[PDB]
Amino acid sequence: VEKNRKIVAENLEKVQAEAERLDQEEAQYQREYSEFKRQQLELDDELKSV
Amino acid sequence: MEGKWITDQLRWKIMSCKMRIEQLKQTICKGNEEMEKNSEGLLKTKEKN
Numbered sequence: 785v786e787k788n789r790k791i792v793a794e795n796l797e798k799v800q801a802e803a804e805r806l807d808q809e810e811a812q813y814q815r816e817y818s819e820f821k822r823q824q825l826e827l828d829d830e831l832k833s834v
Numbered sequence: 835m836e837g838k839w840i841t842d843q844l845r846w847k848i849m850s851c852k853m854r855i856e857q858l859k860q861t862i863c864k865g866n867e868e869m870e871k872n873s874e875g876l877l878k879t880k881e882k883n
Contacts, residue, residue, distance in 0.1 A: 785865040796876045803883050813840065 785862055789865055789868055792872050796872050798878045799883060
């Protein structure tokens with residue numbers, strides 16, 4: 785019971801570390817996608833102004 | 835007392851074992867509750883991921 789507890793504990797730790805990795809990826813996505821949105825929002829009004 | 839001391843060493847060896855049997859039992863019981871908890875956490879974190 786001690787050994788297989790460490791195995792599942794490590795499995796949980798390894799998988800949750802990946803969730804944090806994809807959280808860090810989304811964070812950068814949000815940053816990058818927001819600047820694309822900001823540029824698209826200015827192009828939307830520039831297409832209207834033209 | 836020499837006769838009672840010998841038997842009373844055993845009476846302590848038995849009682850001492852009983853305390854380790856109890857503790858080790860509940861240690862497994864607690865060791866197995868972390869199984870269902872962390873394995874279920876493993877599952878939910880795998881579907882989530």
